[PDB]
UniProtKB/Swiss-Prot annotation, chain B:
The lineage of its organism: Eukaryota, Metazoa, Chordata, Craniata, Vertebrata. InterPro entries: Ketohexokinase-related, KHK, PfkB_dom, Ribokinase-like. GO terms for biological process: fructose metabolic process; regulation of glycogen metabolic process; response to fructose; response to glucose; response to insulin; response to sucrose; response to zinc ion. This is Ketohexokinase. Requires potassium. Inhibition by ADP. Pathway: Carbohydrate metabolism; fructose metabolism.
């Protein structure tokens, strides 16, 4: 019961730092370039390791030079990679990220290689005893529901102090993913998902979606520079203002920084209010830096 | 390994990793869109000409700057996949190996480019001075860092001065960017290639106008070459006779990226084989035309 497991994507982010966002049909020169290990669950693993949490990553990779870069980067961070679902078909996903140096805006052109996703059969072969917390990035919902049903079955057979805490992230406005609201002790819903469901604020989103979560769950919604809100079974709306840096330089992975920090703070026994504040604090600190170094 | 004396064609210039993404619509700032296709391609003028030389059956070598890393590894493996000798690469301790990002809009064919950064130092005259020239029969220089490249050209001239006419290294220069610093390179090389883009920026409306207007800038005996895309290419040598070749357009145009480099490599290859300027022009247009109907460089020969 020592590690935090993150199930989701690992993507090579090919980043270009620009003075201004390029206009269509133009040729602009970038200021600088870097390769960064990306993906939601993968970025959250980076943040958890930097916060001092033992953590593991579970996701699909294909053998090759890009996987080697990613594996060496995970290993450099102290991220346990023993649970990686190695594939025999498809390439590892990669993406072109354009980071605007004047405001930190990040634009992503993702290349989805259509690598097979982590399955419920892959998850069944995992020894759950070493994990205190399991975070699932919503992707292949029907297959992930079976993974969540397996964690529930395990917890059923465990004393309350040995129960694995669960968090779920619904970040894409995909109908298939909305069944994941009913799973996990902590549900993270993105601003994009909230707006696509017609909600104009985090408070509207939380009140409008709480009926979809399981009994006792906490629903969390970060609204970028407007801060973040949480709603638990007591019906009390919790809010944290954002911690914007004076100069926002790189927002790529800000949401993942927030998720990992909320998870970390809750796993340390801190209140939902404290975890919300800590999440914004670390997300804000990150927005003032290129990448994840120096967040702690 | 052992490279036989006077056997290789060297190309000095840029190598870049081109990340090309095809999108249904241009992305709005701060958005996450999925592309239809994404390909990593080795680019750069000297680099593309190297690919074409290898496919034409010429032993060839690339000289350009790279920094150790994963971008360089991909580029090195791509050069090797194309049979390009990479022993002359100027490995750098500072800067990034060039990487560019091209977004192609599938709904209108628009190309948006986020060009590589300028952190990597170019091949210097000091780097070039440490190169034993005996293994090269032809040295082609892609005009970049002009003042440094002039010293490289002056070194090749010094070498040729003490060689019998059959062991003299032939030289070609490409002026492809409309940058003033590059225009001093017109005075170097047995063969000078001037792009349509450079010609138009100097106010020339055709290859004939460009060749007649710029011939005064080349060294005694040099041949000035100007390809004008689907209008074909022209050459002008010391005899004052304008030479022309019509283009050889493919039945369906698929990919024109690297067509100019294909033409340069083919002209160089044909001249290195002892063929006339007229024959080399025609061969250059034939290979450039064949390439335009193909995706990439496979199947050009
Ligand atoms: C997670 C949320 C939490 O609600 C505070 N925090 C911030 N999110 C920001 N986002 C989110 C989205 C990225 C893309 O992944 C864009 C920008 C920006 C800032 C900041 F104000 F620093 F600019 C902050 C903060 N603090
Ligand atoms: C090198 C020149 C030479 O003058 C014949 N050759 C061609 N160049 C073409 N270009 C070049 C430029 C790309 C942009 O990267 C546009 C298109 C097109 C054709 C073709 F007729 F096939 F379409 C041909 C030929 N042959």
């Amino acid at each position: 019961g020592s590690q935090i497991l993150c199930v989701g994507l690992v993507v090579l982010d090919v980043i270009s730092l620009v003075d201004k966002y390029p206009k269509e049909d133009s040729e602009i020169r970038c200021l600088s370039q870097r390769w960064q290990r990306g993906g939601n669950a993968s970025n959250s693993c980076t943040v958890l390791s930097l916060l001092g949490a033992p953590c593991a990553f579970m996701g699909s990779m294909a053998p090759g030079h890009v996987a080697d870069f990613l594996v060496a980067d995970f290993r450099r961070r102290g991220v346990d990679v023993s649970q990686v679902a190695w594939q025999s078909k498809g390439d590892t996903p990669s993406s072109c990220c354009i980071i605007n140096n004047s405001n930190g805006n990040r634009t992503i052109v993702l290349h989805d290689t259509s690598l097979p996703d982590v399955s419920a059969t892959d998850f069944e072969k995992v020894d759950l005893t070493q994990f205190k917390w399991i975070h699932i990035e919503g992707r292949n919902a029907s297959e992930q529901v079976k993974m969540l049903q397996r964690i529930d079955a395990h917890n059923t057979r465990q004393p309350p102090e040995q129960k694995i805490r669960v968090s779920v992230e619904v970040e894409k406005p995909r109908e298939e993913l909305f069944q994941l609201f009913g799973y996990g002790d902590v549900v993270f819903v993105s601003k994009d998902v909230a707006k696509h469901l017609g909600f104009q604020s985090a408070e509207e989103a939380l009140r409008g979606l709480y009926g979809r979560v399981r009994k006792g769950a906490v629903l969390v919604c970060a609204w970028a520079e407007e801060g973040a809100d949480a709603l638990g079974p007591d019906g009390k709306l919790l809010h944290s203002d954002a911690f914007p840096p004076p100069r926002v330089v790189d927002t790529l992975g800000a949401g993942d920084t927030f998720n990992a920090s909320v998870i970390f703070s809750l796993s340390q026994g801190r209140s939902v209010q404290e975890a919300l504040r800590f999440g914004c604090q670390v997300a804000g600190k990150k927005c003032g830096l290129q990448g994840f170094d120096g967040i702690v």
